[PDB]
Structures are given as C-alpha cells and as structure tokens.
Amino acid sequence: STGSATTTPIDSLDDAYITPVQIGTPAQTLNLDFDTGSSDLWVFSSETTASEVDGQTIYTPSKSTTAKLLSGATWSISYGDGSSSSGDVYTDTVSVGGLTVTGQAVESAKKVSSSFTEDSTIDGLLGLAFSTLNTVSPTQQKTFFDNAKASLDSPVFTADLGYHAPGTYNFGFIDTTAYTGSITYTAVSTKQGFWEWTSTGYAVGSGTFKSTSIDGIADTGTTLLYLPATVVSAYWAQVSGAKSSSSVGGYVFPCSATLPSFTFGVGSARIVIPGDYIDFGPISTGSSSCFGGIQSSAGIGINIFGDVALKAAFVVFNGATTPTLGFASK
Numbered sequence: 001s002t003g004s005a006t007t008t009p010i011d012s013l014d015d016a017y018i019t020p021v022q023i024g025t026p027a028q029t030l031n032l033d034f035d036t037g038s039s040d041l042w043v044f045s046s047e048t049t050a051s052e053v054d055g056q057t058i059y060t061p062s063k064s065t066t067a068k069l070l071s072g073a074t075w076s077i078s079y080g081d082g083s084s085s086s087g088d089v090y091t092d093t094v095s096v097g098g099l100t101v102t103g104q105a106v107e108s109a110k111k112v113s114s115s116f117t118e119d120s121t122i123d124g125l126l127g128l129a130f131s132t133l134n135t136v137s138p139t140q141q142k143t144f145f146d147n148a149k150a151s152l153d154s155p156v157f158t159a160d161l162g163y164h165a166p167g168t169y170n171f172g173f174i175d176t177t178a179y180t181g182s183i184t185y186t187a188v189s190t191k192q193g194f195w196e197w198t199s200t201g202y203a204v205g206s207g208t209f210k211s212t213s214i215d216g217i218a219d220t221g222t223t224l225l226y227l228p229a230t231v232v233s234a235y236w237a238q239v240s241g242a243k244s245s246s247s248v249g250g251y252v253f254p255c256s257a258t259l260p261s262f263t264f265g266v267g268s269a270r271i272v273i274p275g276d277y278i279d280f281g282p283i284s285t286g287s288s289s290c291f292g293g294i295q296s297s298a299g300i301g302i303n304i305f306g307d308v309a310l311k312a313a314f315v316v317f318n319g320a321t322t323p324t325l326g327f328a329s330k
Contacts, residue, residue, distance in 0.1 A: 001099055001100075001148070001151045001152055002098070002153055002170070002171060002172035003099025003170070003172065004097040004098065004168060004170045004171070004175075005019050005021075005096050005168070005169050006166050007161065007162075007168065007169050008166045009164065009165070009166070010121040011121070012281075013281055014161075014163065014164060014311065015223050016119075016223060016307075017033065017034070017307070018032065018123075019126070019169055021126060023043065023059050023106055024061070024063070024065075024067055025064055025066040025093060026064075028059055028060065028063070028064065029057075030044070030057050030124055031057065032122070032123060032126040033125045034125075034126045034128055034169055034220055034221070035125050035126065036128040036129055036194075036195055036218055036219055036221065036317065037127075037129055037194060037195075037217060037220070037222060037304070038079065038125065038129055038133060039128075039129045039134040040077050040107050040125065040135055040136070041104065041106060041107060041124070041127055041143065042075065042077070042085055042106075042108070042109055042124050043058070043059040043106060043107070043109065043123060044056040044057070044058045044112070045059045045108040045109055046059070046062065046108075047087060047088065047108050047109070048108075048110060049110065052116075052117045054117050054118065057123045058123070059108065061092065061106075061108065064092055066093045066102075067090045067092045067106075068092070069089075069090055070088075070089040070090060070091055070105060070136075070139075070141075073136050073141075074086070074088055075087060075088075075089060075107045075135045075136045076135055079221075080300065081115070082113075083113045083116060084112075085109045085111060085113065085116060087107060087108045087109040087110035087111065088107075089105055089107050090105075090106045090108055091103045091105055091106065094144060096126075096144065096169070097169070097171065099171050101144055101148050103147070105134075105136060105142070107136065109124070125221065126144055128144070128220070129143070129193055130143075130146075145157055145319060146319075151172075152171060152173075153172045154172055154174070155172075156171075156172065156173070156174060156317060156318050157169060157170060157171045157172075158175070158314065158315060159220050159314075159315045160175075160314050160315070160330070163276070163311050163312075167311070178314050178330060179313075179314035179328035179329065180328065180329050184326065184327055184328070185267075185316070185318070185325065186198070186266055186267055186324065187324060188318075194217040194218075194302075195217055195218040195219075195325055196216070197215070197216070198213050198215045199215075199216065199266065200212075200213065200214075200265030200267060201213075202214070202227075202231055202262065202265065203262070203263040204238050204260055204263075205238055206260075209265065210234075211265070214228065214264075215302075215303060216297075216303030216305050217303070217304055217305065218325055222304045223280075223293075223306055223307050223308070224280070224293050224294070224308050225273070225278075225293060225304070225305060225309045226300055226302075226303055226304040226306065227294065227295075227296070227297055227303050228296070228297060229297075232295060232296045235294050236251050236292065236294070239253045239257050239259060240254070240257065241254040241257065242292070244296075245289075248283050248291070250296070251292035251294070252283060252289045252292060253289070253292055254288060255281075255282060255288045255290040257290075258275060259275030259278045259279055260275050261273055261274050262275075262278065262294060266327040271313045271329060272312060272329070273309060273312040277293060277308055278292060278293035279292075280292065312329075312330075313328060313330065314327070314328040314329075
C-alpha cells in the first residue's frame, strides 16, 4: 500500500504545516501537524476542557463506530517549546492520503496548554519519530508509520515541504519526479528516539564550505533551524545590523536586509537554503526588526534541522531495519 497527502502552511510564515487525517467511522477529518520529532498521535476532542478549545476541529469518539477506549491508558507530553497536552486513549481507524491503519492509538486530549488553544489551525499532532518516544502509559503505543510499515510497498515516508506553498507527505514510495539529481542517504542514530544524523558542514552565502560534523535531528515539527552558536554567529555576521536579542529571544535583523543563503552538507552533497527561507518577518506587527530563521541551539541540548532546512529538500525517512535519512535538492 501507499498514501499521499498534501501538507499546507498554517500561515504566511510557514510557522507549521497541517495535513488532513481521517479518524473513525464515519470519517472525522482533522488537520494534524506531522511531527518527525515526536511519537504521539493526539487530537483535540470532545473530552478537551471546553475553555481550552478555540476554533479547532475535535474528534468525538462516541460518534465513531470503530472507536474503542484503550482501558487504563493515559498520555502526557511536553514539547521543546514548553507546550504540553495530556489525556486518555482510544484505538480507531486512521487514514492518511488513502493509507489506512486499523487499531491506531488516537490520544484524546483532556488538557492542552495555551499555545495549542491559541492556534486554531492545528487540531493535533501526528508523531513520526520512533515509537520508543511514545508517552502512552502503561502500554506504550506505536506511531502511525510503525503500524503501517509492514503493509507499505517500501518502509519509508517522505517529506516535501513547500516554501510559502503546499507540499506533500508520501508513505510507502519515493516519487522520483519530486526532486532533482540524486538522493544522498546518511546514517541515523535511533538512540534518542529521533531521526538523528550528522551533517558534514555548512557554508554561508557564496562562502567556502566548512567541513565539520553537526549532529542533529530532522524535525518537521520544529519551525526553525537550530545550530551551534559558532555556526549561527558566522551566518548572522554576514547580515548588516543583525544581532542576538535576549529580549526578543534570538537573532533579529533589519527587515530591509537581503539575507544570504545557508548551505548544509549531507555526505558529499549540499542542500542550499535560500536566504528568503530564513526571514520570519517582523517581531511584532509593524516592526522593522525581523526574526531570523537560523537560531542557536545552545539552550536546547540538540541541533534541530527544522522546517527552514527541510523545506529546501526532498527528505526520505527510511524505516528499514537499519533506518537512514535521504536528502535531495528539488
């Protein structure tokens, strides 16, 4: 089997991407944030505290003839941005782009933190990291990809995120028309539960490539590119007037600037992030200070190849017995 679904930016900045997902019988379609940095499929629901729902579409398990309470199971997750959610668990039929999994754990939110409430466009998350990170207790549950894998034509999914435009998540096949050149594959460590890999270096604009190992994670659920402070300083030093602002929470730059590109290495291959992809717009409405799309990872503990980086590539998440990542230009 295969599946193919379009993923759409939630706003004009590509702050996140939403993909329609069918849950239950008859189908209830929710727009989920596909997150290769976590491993829970959770949704706003008829159980979510009413004051914490503000415009999201909810899953109502009592209206699904295939929903079953997973008795005794609870979940609770906290994300790197400080947001969180928790609740109980149903199993139900879940379909993405024509690919159907029966008995998928659908984690129903009883509580969500304010940033989820405040984002009316995201109805939940669909985790695509390794199932060892799934938070369901006392019986850990499998991701949608893990459940689908054996049925797929090939044990892979691909992320093809658009810049200020829709893109595609495919399951079970590699669309050879969706990228240019060849796909360069690179080793993955699953030891932390992430799609963790080592970039071979970087360049800023037209500058020379610096060969240096940068361990980080391919994370579709993180908006920006978070790299070591040395690398980030070297980038922003090429932008007149750019500075790190403690009050704003990262590097800012004059909105009048033209940003240089940023290149990252994948083995001997190179992925070029155009400068425009690094512009996240005014820090507040009407400001002439703009927020940068490359930020320091120093306070995180891990480097994160988020959407800013991934949207410059066609990315293969290869879930074979030894997982690997593939990157192609497009």
